[PDB]
Amino acid sequence: MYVKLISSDGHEFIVKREHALTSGTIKAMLSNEVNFREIPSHVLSKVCMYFTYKVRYTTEIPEFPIAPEIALELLMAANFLDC
Amino acid sequence: LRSVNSREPSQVIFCNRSPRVVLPVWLNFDGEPQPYPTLPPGTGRRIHSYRGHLWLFRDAGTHDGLLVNQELFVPSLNPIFANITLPVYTLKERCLQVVRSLVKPLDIVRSLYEDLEDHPNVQKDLER
Amino acid sequence: MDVFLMIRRHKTTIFTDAKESSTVFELKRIVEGILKRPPDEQRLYKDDQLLDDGKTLGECGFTSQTARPQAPATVGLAFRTFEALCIEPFSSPPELP
C-alpha cells in the first residue's frame, strides 16, 4: 500500500503508506494523493529519501546527507510537515 | 543528575561510531558538566571511571546530541563499551545543523530564525 | 540484503526496496502492483542498459552498499510498441546566498 505525494512542479512521488505516515501533517492531508504547492521536486525527493532512512535506522547510523543548495528549502519543507 | 561517588573503579572504552568529533562530558558530583578530551571519528579510547558516574557525549563543534549505547552512559561493574552513534535526528534539526554550519550567526519565517539560534546546549538538555 | 531504489519514468518516481537476490522480473511485479501495468509492458534500465528479467538486482549492480536508504539507486522505467526511456529531471535549486 502506497500514496502519491506530488511536488510543486508535477513530479509524482509514490512511497509506502507507512513511510508517509511518519509525517503527522501528511497523515492529516491523507485523512490518498497529497499535493504540495510550495515544495519542488528536488526538495520532495529528499523528504522521501529521509522517510526510508528514518524507517530503516530507527548497528551504526550514517549521516543523512543534505547538499548546501537545497538546505534552506528542505528546512522550510521539514518545518511545515514537522518531519 | 550527578555522578554517584562510588570510588569503585570502572574500565570503559569510548568507542566513536559517528562521523563527528565526539566530546565526552562527565557530570561531576555536583552535576556540573566536565569536558574530556575529544575522540576523532572512528577512534577509540580506553578510559578509567567509576561505577555510578554520569557520561554524555556531543558533537564537539556544534554540541549536537549523540547517543551512547542508544542517551546517558553509566559505567557499571566490569571493561565496558560506550558506543557513541549518530541518532536519527529529525529532518528539521538536521537541516538546522547543515544551515548553522554554512552561515555565521536570511530568507525564512521568523519562527525559523529562532530555531537556528536555539543552539543545542548541554546545560539545556540537562534540565530535560 | 535490502537494496533501496527509486524507480523512475517521466514524472513518476516510486521509492521501494528489494532484496539483492530478487530479480528484475520480480521488480517488474512490484511496479505492476503500483502502477498497474503488467511486466511484459515494462522495460527496466540501469542507466541506458536494458535489464534482463532473469538477472538479479545484485548482478545488475544494485548492491546493499550502493543502493542505500538515504541514497537510493535509480532504475529506469519504460512502458509499451515500447516507448523510449524518459525521466524528467528534478527541479533545480536556487543560487546560494
Author numbering:
A (entry chain B): 17 to 47, 58 to 84, 88 to 112
B (entry chain C): 63 to 132, 134 to 141, 146 to 172, 178 to 200
C (entry chain A): 1 to 80, 84 to 100
Task: Please give sentences taken from the publication describing this entry.
To determine the crystal structures of VBC in complexes with coumarin derivative compounds, we attempted co-crystallization and soaking with each of the 25 compounds (2–5 mM of 25 purchasable coumarin derivatives). Successful results were obtained using soaking for 7HC_1(DE22) and 7HC_5(D3), and co-crystallization for 7HC_2(D7). Three 7HC derivative-bound VBC structures were determined and refined at resolutions of 2.60, 2.46, and 3.00 Å. Similar to the previously reported VBC structures, four VBC complex molecules existed in the asymmetric unit of the crystal. The 7HC_1(DE22) molecule was modeled in three chains (B, H, and K), VBC−7HC_2(D7) was modeled in all four chains (B, E, H, and K), and 7HC_5(D3) was modeled in only one chain (the K chain). Our molecules bound to the previously reported “ELOC site”, to which some small molecules and cullin-2 (CUL2)-derived peptides can bind. The 2-oxo group of each 7HC derivative formed a polar interaction with the main-chain carbonyl group of Glu102, and the 7-hydroxy group also interacted with the side chain of Glu64. When we superimposed our three 7HC structures with the VBC−MB235 complex structures, the ligand-binding sites were identical. A structural comparison of ligand-free and ligand-bound ELOC showed that the hydrophobic pocket structure was nearly identical. These results show that ligand recognition is likely due to conformational selection, rather than an induced fit.
